[PDB]
């Protein structure tokens, strides 16, 4: 269940929140069909290692082992792997020089925005930018992680779509009485995919009742991360959505939300996002085919003008060479 | 995807009582997901469509009926009774594209059942002559979901020699196991099994001689007649072919005795159906073997009806749910 | 999934314990992808029949039927099959001689060591030897069966492996303080695979074992106090699933049985935790997106096992 797609293999993907990787801890993740083990030594400020979850001796998951000092120890015969992935001790043969092949498969890892980013290949692109991270005007919160039984590209398709707001988000992000979708612009260029400012009508639980005209904007430099800005005259909310491609048919959605208003709004922010993410997931789980259809049994997709963003997304994925999770 | 003999035939997918005005229900037929819906209007017709919005591929059954339209939950496109999209809410003054239309199927209500044809209905719905006979009362069994090929289910319903064993004490007698000779005929009226007698009393009592015959004009529907000196019982058994390996069995039962026998009737059928299902779920392979690992089937003279069934399916060019 | 490997099809495999097959009983098992029915008539000391679990009339499992006198009766139309597998009676036609094809597929069965051994092919090899069975100084006990979601050859590989004792069997077969594995000898010849004497420092137990059958292991463990032998059998359900049984004999007091069963239960379950996790599921042989296995000197027995399986031509459950 792996991919040759270099835009996917040679890119950075979130696999965990840094808060879930304590010193001395072992955790697991799955990315693009590969089983990962994440571990840290007990030392303060220890780096996070992200390896293939696999002991090359007899094929046991290293995640079933234990962290000892600065090493991860396999449970079956106790081979110890240092932070660089090299076996430094074979207990049955304490004096031998361990073979060069006694080495875990290691991956590039980088903590950014409080998230653990992993690259399984050779990183040609940087981690997506998130300018408000360093802005002290902005408070932050993290949603829980949502496991979704849909293609990661269908999950992103739904997050680019704006015309569904008055229907599945009626009463939250739209209003069954204002269903018309105002004109907006979309561009695919060196910045990636950008949806220009899009105004829509709704009151929101995180603001005042009369603050009922919102304007959204977003950019994907990476096909599975979205930087979204939602702004009213009273408040500005930004978020970094990341979709972890577990395999072709399963995804993990995470959202890092920041806002330039009272820190007291955090509970309402998480409530709104939980409500709307779950409304989206009900649709996502139902869509067929599972793979995202690109532009070209079941009838072909129909496109109307307010689909210009999701059409541009399908065009972009084709231009990027994506074959994983798309059809 | 099934053969054209199955595609161009009528299959029961629901009881008309399952489909109230304003309601949405679902069914599956020959691998196709179906949505059934009715407006709120009195005596409104049932629409049966493929359960699929062509915009972004959401099941229309997750939507709602509004007036005389079905509305998709995702972006609110509205489909009239003919399946044409009449409104795209994001663009209220835009004429919907001609491609914006649900795939619709033929639907007819008959005998209180919802019949569907996914193709072109060359054949008629099977006949059921007792339906309008004022001497006969009617009842419907519940539907039975069966994890077996629909053609295995029908094979078991054509089989008569198993009565003294898995229906001992209901349709057969373990002391009377011999199967007297009978005639079977396959012609343009389908498969008919001639009269055959089996010595057993039924709960529907010295009435222990029943003469049965049945006809299939349609490989997945069976019209069964059972008559004693005291009473005549007929039934229409319909097998909905969900896919190659799964079936829904329904029976419509009519009888010319007292209507107070209904509860006992439903119990007899429930008992014998579940006795059959226990065998059906166990048979291997799952798909019905036609005439020519696991050994080939063996046929004895009392299998002539189930042998003729397999020959008929081959003549009709059935490849779906058979092996 | 079935195999053509002759070392597997033409060999004997344990499918049941004899005490599990009482007179008049019907039980089921799977072997090498085949569904089996085991049955016995009600008469005393009746033989055990082992057939493919399949009525050739309409494909019903015979195991859903009943034993009547000396016959197994299919539940659907009541065809009666005698102890040789021949259909003797078709009740729809009481006076008819059944078709010659009306016959169960029967397999060779033999009771030995209190176990039911089955050969699905041509018995070329004999059942493995177990000398202490005939020794009145030795008591016997049987573990329960263990269903393991791993290739049977992975299960046997783990049983030949000795260097894992201080880690997953710390406190039972090894000691985390003594992890170095001393030199030992292994031989593969016509008698199969023999591991020579080795001892684990935790007085100490001295052990050796032999496989003449690639899925059966004869183990010997000796300390100054007593001697324990066991016959470990691994039934290959399919390429990815196994049933582990042990027949244990010892010449100490009979009262040790309960503790020994618990010790075996503890260590078997420690092994199963590893076996269920190993990837790939099939045992990798030598010299063929996961890296290839690494071997150190203390792996000499499991290396010799992989070499043996290749020369035996095993393709089922290996990769
Ligand atoms: N659950 C969601 N909340 C929304 C916020 C943006 O703010 C607003 N008002 O939409 N964040 C975000 N990434 N997106 C993409 C899709 C949809 O706009 C949304 N998904
Ligand atoms: N459960 C079952 N009851 C029986 C009744 C008999 O028919 C009548 N009319 O009583 N109906 C029917 N379709 N069949 C087919 C096989 C078997 O005779 C049976 N299956
Ligand atoms: N669970 C296990 N207990 C051990 C006993 C030892 O044998 C005796 N005779 O005591 N039996 C056996 N088959 N083996 C092989 C590996 C390991 O020595 C062991 N596995
Ligand atoms: S399998 Fe990891 S040390 Fe042997
Ligand atoms: S998916 Fe049905 S209206 Fe968009
Ligand atoms: S299936 Fe066994 S007797 Fe008919
Ligand atoms: Cl119609
Ligand atoms: Cl009446
Ligand atoms: Fe949404
Ligand atoms: Fe029956
Ligand atoms: Fe072990």
Residue numbers in the entry:
A (entry chain B): 1 to 296, 304 to 334
B (entry chain A): 3 to 206, 209 to 296, 304 to 334
C (entry chain C): 1 to 202, 212 to 297, 304 to 334
Manuscript excerpt for this entry:
To investigate the architectural parameters that dictate the substrate specificity and site-selectivity of a Rieske oxygenase catalyzed reaction, we focused on two Rieske oxygenases, SxtT and GxtA, which are involved in the biosynthesis of paralytic shellfish toxins. These enzymes share 88% sequence identity with one another and selectively install a hydroxyl group on adjacent C12 and C11 positions of a tricyclic saxitoxin scaffold, respectively. Each structure showcases an α3 trimeric architecture, and each protomer of the trimer contains a Rieske cluster in the N-terminal domain and a non-heme iron center in the C-terminal domain. The trimeric quaternary architecture places these metallocenters within electron transfer distance of one another across the subunit-subunit interfaces.
To investigate how the native hydroxylated substrates bind to SxtT and GxtA and to identify global architectural differences between these proteins, we solved the structures of SxtT and GxtA with β-STOH bound, as well as that of GxtA with STX, bound to 1.79-, 1.79-, and 1.74-Å resolution, respectively. In SxtT, the presumed native substrate β-STOH shows slight deviations in its position in the active site relative to that observed with ddSTX, but it maintains interactions with Arg204, Cys228, Gln226, Ser230, Asp239, Tyr273, and Thr276. The differentiating feature between β-STOH and ddSTX, the C12 β-hydroxyl group, forms only one additional interaction in the SxtT active site with Tyr198. This interaction is mediated by a water molecule and Tyr198, like Cys228, Asp239, and Tyr273 is conserved in GxtA. The most significant structural difference between these substrate-bound structures of SxtT and GxtA is the orientation of a loop that connects the β13 and β14 strands of the C-terminal iron-binding domain. In SxtT, this loop extends toward the active site and interacts with β-STOH as well as with non-conserved residues Ser230 and Glu272. Two of the corresponding loop residues in SxtT (Val206 and Ile209) are hydrophobic and unlikely to reside on the protein surface or form similar interactions with the corresponding surface residues Pro233 and Glu234. Accordingly, whereas both orientations of the GxtA loops reveal an open path from the surface of the protein to the substrate-binding site, the SxtT loop, which is tucked into the protein interior, blocks the analogous path in the crystal structure. Outside of considering the overall loop architecture, in SxtT, the loop is important as it interacts with a bound substrate using residue Arg204. This Arg204 interaction, coupled with additional interactions that are formed between active site residues (Thr276, Gln226, Ser230, Asp239, and Tyr273) and the guanidinium groups of the five- and six-membered rings of β-STOH, ensures that three regions of ddSTX and β-STOH are recognized by SxtT.
